[PDB]
Assembly symmetry: D2
Homo-oligomer: 296 residues x 4
């Protein structure tokens, strides 16, 4: 199978005066490249995918694919939707503009059955030719891709090669790899990056790497080479920042953190997202003080 | 405030060969009218709002609004979205086609804070002029509109007049009405329709009424005139079907029931929604048999 | 056509003094309940800190109750549950020997029996004594739940089992219960939702709030049973703020704090692992208490 | 600090004619000893502690203490209770009768606060001068010992040396060991034994080792010597049996498995525990057939 693994970053989408700051976007990707990141995920959850127009969705993917040309960094484009026809179109668009693969979240809100999830992802997988990574985050979608469903899709479709797990349930990660040791399980879940890798996971799609890409990258490569004491030591150091980045819903804390670090000039969200509370603002800024945040 | 209360129906959307069967849609709405329903909700969750194109949204509201003219039956159009800019446009779009009010679900997937939720709904409420009904269904959205947020929204904008509560938490309904007895709390969970009405709720938005409109209508009107023992007896009779209509995710069971009763000519969903389980199919057909289902 | 114990009931607190049961304060708190329209008292239940009581203190509190209530219309529904079936049978026979009118028996906690085991647990209790038995379902504390089907089978198969106290926070289960078995006595176990459970056919409450405001809980219950539903809802709404604040921390920590603030008990003592609340919740409890009128002795 | 770590077994209590089969009890401990087990936990949750009299509690601890005399196996006696006065007595009893340490479950049913939990365990720790291992199992107790409480107890009491975690929340174990890396975290969930050990855990208290002691024993020792490829393979092989052992509440499945393997002579529980359903009986028996179960 064609795969996309390693240390990956769920890119934030910087806004300025209500529009996407395109040049800030390219420089944030270049910082990630220069800090050992293996792949970037434009216009996903952390990139505020729900509040983007369809042209800003297209434009941000194009910037990522053009900034990653001439490097080892792959572009894993966000292309999920709770309507199968739309997710097929988003998949076809990501492939036609040079993405290396697609991330595709489980359909949200409309709560399809396990049968529906199978026909959903199979319809995406058989219409386009690029690697497809499933994304399970039941706290946001209202549904779960069962272990049985993930494994059937992995065996039935050649483009489906793994799953990003944001369940908070390492029992499910044991279940998956014990029955299907050939799939690429990706951590979607920063605080427990090391335990997922130590059980055979092959990468992370992390929010923290927006702020500390060099540490997330080192954590990942230590683990993939089975340097488990070094990878765990980094996972332990990152715990405080890994947790505070969800004091409110992601990407509210991480974007506040990038702004406090001076990596974005403006702290803008699109409604219904907004800036955090004054107390949570102080909590993020105080956790930040004990870490070293690398510049451009 | 202008209000939309009483017995209301969350309309299913009949498909025929993958497109919307318009004639049948008009014929199902008049069936609801002739059976004592006070208002209809086109293209909401039960109407498969996520898998409809933007024209299907339009024509379904237009047919509903037109079939209802010359009756007292109001059209409360679904117009929610998890992007505030989009939800404002859909609200403007619903008034522009003759809706009496709008239902607007809490943003899903992107998990906004209470501050963001307030500014989301305040933006919708102040951009257009028809009654606005909040909809809280945390099992589907990943977020919950707090009682204080609901009450603040109700008191600050003239448009917002109540909430459809589908949390399954009667404590929350006591909380709302004990602190703000002027809002219209609308039931969003059929099994507990009577207990919500007996605590001061002023209507239901029902899935069961697609199948049994006369019984949901009678339940609601008995309760509003405080004939509690009749409202309770009908609520008790409906319990078995109220549960079975959610053996799988709505609107899968209810549409299967409409098809078995010969009220729609084809049992078509749009992916990721699909036909029900085989065992659940039998469960629907067997409890369906214990009630009387009126024809056209 | 079974024997029932219904109406407005109070889950009594157990006042401590220097680690000992203040027997006389216990007798005088029961008299306050009697004089304020309460239909029954539940000694040595959850609110009475049954887990930290000695076995002798268990009895004396039932004996104090049975005897203070003699010469009144107030019944004694004794706490007698256990997560060991052999023990709960003895506790049932025991409450019968000391004059109890019926027993409350919590679902087995910690050891999570299956529905089959729950059925055999309660069938053993019910067939051991000829006294009314009220099931108590509180999954947040026990880790298990008595399903609707199990409760109905126990109600139909045992003559002593006559209902359930529900502290599920799930009005759907109460609809389910009474729609399929309208003859059972469903008792509310959550004060904030006392009125909605009565309005669906519930026949009583076992209340924490009536320790503090017995006249209002009793009036709430009696209005509802007489189908004066708007008056019952009006009191339920007034009680909401105090009904919620009484669980800012684990019951009986808030209510015992309130009783001390109202001068109804003379010391604010718990038995470990229970202790007094945080200072922030203490202030919130004491500030909500100030908007209600609290009866003395 | 004095510690008790490694591969440990939560002993079942075999009954014969409603009575404790003492000679069977001694021999089940000898089997564990002969199969590489580092410690035994008599009269815990798996030992049906709730339904044992206070004399059967003693006798089983004395049998454990006497069967392990002259071996490297330590006795971690069960001594928890939801009344602080009783748990102090149970602790005092285990020490006077030669236990190496005590397991002490968080108070159940009465839902103490974190303040109360600290005062409960500090009273126990100051009661006896033997190691005390906390036990956090919120699904059974109704409360959880927070990370902050565990750490305060670990630093304030010299006898408290770690925690057995059965929350199913690998995030909490990262939290514990990242802030207090000197504590002994013991796994209380068999399916995720390897991930807890690979993150710095120092042992397991297992239900599965009753049936397959050599395999759990090997898993723990592979992990403690950091042969993670070997530990993970055994953990993955154990996944099916680890799950079926909880198809119904523990210890119903495990005692059923011990009886099917001819290791106990009668399938007796004390009510409210009872024999499993006929279908789970068949499922337990099916799974069993794919492993090898060592005899006496
Ligand atoms: N960025 C490309 C579109 C992806 C779809 C969507 N923006 C929302 C899905 C959507 N169907 C979008 C509305 C557009 C047509 N109504 C929805 O909100 O339901 C998302 O949640 O990721
Ligand atoms: N109110 C006096 C009754 C005390 C009985 C018991 N300690 C039962 C607790 C226990 N026996 C465990 C304590 C003995 C150590 N295993 C049980 O779990 O059943 C309780 O429920 O509090
Ligand atoms: Mg490339
Ligand atoms: Mg549903
Ligand atoms: Mg629904
Ligand atoms: Mg409580
Ligand atoms: Mg309680
Ligand atoms: Mg020894
Ligand atoms: Mg224990
Ligand atoms: Mg000490
Ligand atoms: Mg269990």
């Amino acid at each position: 199978k064609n795969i996309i693994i390693g240390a990956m970053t769920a890119l934030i989408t910087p806004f300025k005066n209500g529009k996407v700051d395109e040049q800030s976007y390219a420089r944030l990707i270049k910082r990630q490249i220069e800090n050992g990141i293996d792949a970037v995920v434009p216009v996903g959850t952390t990139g505020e995918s729900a509040t983007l127009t369809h042209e800003e969705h297209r434009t941000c993917i194009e910037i990522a694919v053009e900034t990653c040309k001439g490097t080892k960094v792959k572009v894993l484009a966000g292309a999920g939707s709770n309507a199968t026809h739309e997710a097929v179109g988003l998949a076809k668009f990501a492939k036609e503009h040079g993405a290396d693969g697609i991330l595709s979240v489980a359909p949200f809100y409309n709560k399809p059955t396990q049968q529906g999830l199978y026909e959903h992802y199979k319809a995406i997988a058989q219409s386009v030719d690029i690697p497809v990574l499933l994304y399970n985050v039941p706290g946001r979608t209202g549904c779960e891709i069962s272990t049985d469903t993930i494994i059937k899709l992995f065996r039935d479709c050649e483009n489906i090669y793994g799953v990003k797990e944001a369940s908070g349930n390492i029992d499910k990660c044991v279940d998956l790899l014990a029955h299907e040791p050939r799939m690429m399980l990706i951590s979607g879940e920063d605080a427990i990056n090391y335990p997922i890798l130590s059980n055979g996971g092959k990468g992370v799609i992390s929010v923290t790497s927006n702020l500390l890409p060099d540490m997330i990258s080192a954590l990942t490569h230590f683990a993939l080479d089975e340097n488990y004491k070094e990878a765990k030591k980094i996972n332990d150091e990152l715990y405080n920042i890994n947790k505070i980045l969800f004091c409110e819903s992601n990407p509210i804390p991480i974007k506040t953190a990038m702004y406090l670090a001076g990596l974005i000039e403006s702290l803008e969200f699109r409604l219904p997202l907004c800036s955090p509370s004054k107390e949570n603002f102080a909590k993020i800024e105080e956790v930040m003080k004990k870490y070293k945040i690398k510049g451009f």
